[model samples]
Target chain A: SMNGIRWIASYPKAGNTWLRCMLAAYITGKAPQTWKDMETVSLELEGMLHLGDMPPTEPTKPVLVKTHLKADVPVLGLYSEATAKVLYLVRNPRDILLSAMRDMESSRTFARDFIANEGLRGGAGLGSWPENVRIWTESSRDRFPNADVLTMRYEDLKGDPVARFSEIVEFLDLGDPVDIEDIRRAVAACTLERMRELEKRSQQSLSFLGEDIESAYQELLHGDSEFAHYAKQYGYAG
Target chain B: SMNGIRWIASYPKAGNTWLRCMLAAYITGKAPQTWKDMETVSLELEGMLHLGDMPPTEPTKPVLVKTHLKADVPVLGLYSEATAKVLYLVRNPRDILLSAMRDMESSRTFARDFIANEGLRGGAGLGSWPENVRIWTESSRDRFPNADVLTMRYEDLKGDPVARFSEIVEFLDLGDPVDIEDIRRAVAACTLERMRELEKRSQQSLSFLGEDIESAYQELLHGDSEFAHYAKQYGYAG
Candidate 1:
């Protein structure tokens, strides 16, 4: 029932933050000098299109949302070939591993267990998490072209963010050519230095989830060793 | 009287080790890295040129010398406005602070009279070491304009070090511009990660200063508060 779903699906550590900032900047018509936690507030395809269970409202501005769901997961409005749009981001696994390890905190459920085993999977072994990313990237490219998927890599997002962002706005039909420069300024405001500063200085702010934004910021800042080792495997730590 | 003076002046932590690696990388090229004792490696300009007294030699390529002198310190051939070329780099100070404080060992130095307090008269409370960077940068610029004073900011150097290196090569008239890409590849070979790994995996092979390279690497990499702060103040951490 989810129709005309606008989505932002991405593999972890892939410039999802960049996508959100660009879109927000495009919609508000203001170059945000400082990023707010609401910058990450995203609706899923189902939630936006009133699919599954919720009642729908008329699509005013195309609803902006994000997703980490892989190909098979029941994303609401795919099969019918409707004019749904998806902006998907992909980061090189190496940087993703480094960034993810640094940002995410352990879920605590596995923290004690992992520590007990000296940080290892006792029964199943070291081969589950990375597949989630690989599968997701593959899906973004081949599995969901019907959704008008536009793919981007994290390295490009970081290095030449302005050009990458301009491409996104153009792909989304969000604005005119002049909007590109405006969006570039917005993207610059959300530079890593700025984000880290906000995380450190902001007293206590709320995210879209109604949870403390700082906590989520710290959590996403670092987490596990699996990705770290995977990053090593791909020669990215340097 | 001070002759045959080679210097390794860095803007605090912009990548002193990286510079060290470059010197060590070219062990046979005038600046040999085969020192049995790193402590014996004269890092102070006065210590090396005036006190330590390394012999006076003229016919050679770049000398492998390392020193952390104030910009005003005198060096051989510098007054002549010939035979003196320095590669000065700067890093962002904020990350320098974050990385410096995160480590307990570096914190230990922060409590004591750290290196950054070098130029401070009594050190009653020079807030942090970064203040010295401002002092050194201004002094170096004012005094050394006649010399081949090659300069670079840390952010640009780290982002594209080879280009900076190429600039230095041209400034010094070293030869044809060493391809910036190739130089980066060369530096990439001796990354902090690489040095640490080599120390851990092949300690006997890398027993340059008689200490385990890994242990020394960690201590050296985090650096003391003053050094890291200096790196930040000058934008090397960026």
Candidate 2:
């Protein structure tokens, strides 16, 4: 039977999906199935709530779930209390803001406000970027001894996926030994170029994702937004 | 005439003195003098308050001021208005806590509170480690067009002092063509082993400075302190 639940938590557009995709490839030894089937490897936390009051029971594999909620959310409190090993993903808010703007097809001004205010999918309301991160990592740890959180930077993962992914595997204590070859294959399969192509094809019959592979980034960088301090703290370049 | 003021700002025990020592060695072509005389190379900002109203004036070299203030400090407001170049020093807050606990001869519990609150020499109060760093770098840049800040990690400096100090000299625009030999000498003089010997000798009226040359670091590692998140944000090793 599967053990306790583990989490892959992050702000939206902070490469949470990419991480999920990479992990899917790593665990399955194949590229992620069409986006609809990608969740076979891990479930999204928010979606689980529709099951209501009843949670998954006695699975064969460890429950690896994804969440974008601030740490204070009531639902998260359950996981925090149960010795959940969390792999928290942090991205440079600058890039997150850009990716988010594109994902939402929102204006820079609106995106800036979203970052400063309620983050995407504020099911019960959200906090600013700093607040979201601090709450999830630090505050979560404080409130629950079971919250074994290991934080990873998105930039670091992008810069050196083999080493970073290896660390992640070690942190998770996955029974299957993930060798360098496995890491290399997983990284190769999840490159942004390939994933974009997959998204494009899916749109013909079904759109599984909605991130413009186009000019949203160039526009975000050119336009002024006021999240520089948040980004610098994450060691993001201007 | 001094062109303008530059800053050597750091969180307490993040190696502000060692940085100043290296620079003092670099600029004066002599190892740092007694603790009292070390400030001759760079003035400490808090001490400037005792001078009252008038700041250092009519210096022969550009005035490089040392500070352990968050970026929001009122005195720093003056520097932000002018084109002040800042050399911000960052270190693993874990090591910083140990160093600070030793220097202050304080308990880990007290040190934790200090990091979380008014910080060392809180004369006017201060912020947490991340707040201090973010405010000085990102917040300063936001409020002032002229604030030019370059952040250097202490571990990086320790691992490669010659390269790091050379970058500092270049950033300060000291002169045309500082000889490579100068940087090499400065690094040699400021090695932790050498500096420790100097401080020991200072105990008998031949002291260079008073940073504990001993170790209480293991104890700190076992104790609880709240600076881990700050350390993680800066990519500091545990």
Candidate 3:
């Protein structure tokens, strides 16, 4: 089962988990009743190996691997161009900063560190927020040219999971094959509202911003900072 | 003159300067008599910045930057997708390992560290040999999708300089138009023999592998290592 790795990757809190949930519902043909039911491709150095799971797993099948690592980060057996595929997720840093920080008053740290440390670090570990985004989306391309990578924005995916997830299915070329009805069924069950009820959680994981983050993003625009430049490029400026 | 950064990137000793020499001759329409005539886009943070040199520079003119750095290694003002174009160069690691490690005995350290540490490190600094290659060719793509990057192999370029360099010409879309006669003239004038005769070096830069590196590569292949996998994918298998 060495077909390849199809990664569900993003910076922290950029809809990685949500995408996984959707995939879980799509693959198993049943909506996840709890977080435990939403199985993710786990990382390991050995057995039940993700590589093993890529096929038989069918030869045409791919293992859905999860990662927050950059393109350069050395993972076991993933350094080569062969057997690599990826689904990269991204959200505007403005939204990510707000979601990751949760409550405002004392939790401003994530937003501050993420925005202030715009592009300082690197390597296998997550560096800064924007750096992580850069690593997965563009940097991953340089290191793995032949690897199939489908880049999707969180806002785009949230706006329409059926279209995006349909693209994912087509991109992955799943072995079982799925129809439009299957996709609709999968998406209907995986919506944020349905998921919250299934898990009985306090209104969480993908929600409306607590405060206005647009004029909020404008506050940082005054410095002509990398934040503004990155935000604008990632479609936040609109 | 803020057009874009067009990089001539490769791991150490992989015909980067040779490509630069070719570019220098093509741009100025004069064969370089020495390394002095060979201008490369030097990296810097500010003032007479490489960014400034990208256009007046014609608005369509791009700066020919030379780099050995990976895609994830953060560069000043190069973190975005806009204003980026690259010509990435790669050579067989076996040949690079041989050429990079000049005499085979004392220089074995380079070969050893490069091969042994195939995928251990990461960051803004250079990592191992294969890791560096992965970063530029594939990893760079992940981090910069909109940036135009043309991947080239040194062997292929050497085998057919005009065709590859023509791809470079078209890829960059140089400000001044060029004819096939111009490309042939540029490539003809920049041959290794032509360059060495002009520079008067002691038999250097771009030569046949001293010892057989294929059987040498076969020695490493016995273990079924990353080296073989990478070499096979990069078109060295033939």
Q: Write the per-residue lDDT of candidate 3 for residues A1-238, one digit (tens) a residue.
A: 1355666777767887777777778778887776656654323111112111111212254666666655554432233445457777878766666665535535544444544565223222555655666666776667666577778888998888888888877786666666888888888877878766755752221223323433344566444765566667777764
Q: For each candidate, how many residue pairs have backbone atoms clashing (under 3 Å)?
A: 22, 2, 23
List pairs with backbone clashes in candidate 2: B202-B206, B202-B207
Taking all chains together, each candidate's TM-score versus the true structure is 0.33, 0.42, 0.42
Model 2 over residues A86-138: C-alpha lDDT tens digits?
Answer: 78888866556556544333464455455444344343324456666777667
lDDT of 3 by residue, B4-29 (tens): 56666777667877777777778778
User: For all the candidates, what are their Cα RMSDs to the real structure?
Assistant: 26.3, 23.5, 16.6
Report, to 2 decimal places, the DockQ of model 1. 0.01
| Per-residue lDDT of model 1, residues B53-134, tens digit only | 3223352444434444444432332333323455555554433433344344544444222333432221221223454355
Off by over 4 Å in 1: A1-3, A31-61, A75-83, A102-146, A175-178, A197-238, B1-238
Worst 10 residues of 1 chain A by lDDT: A47-56
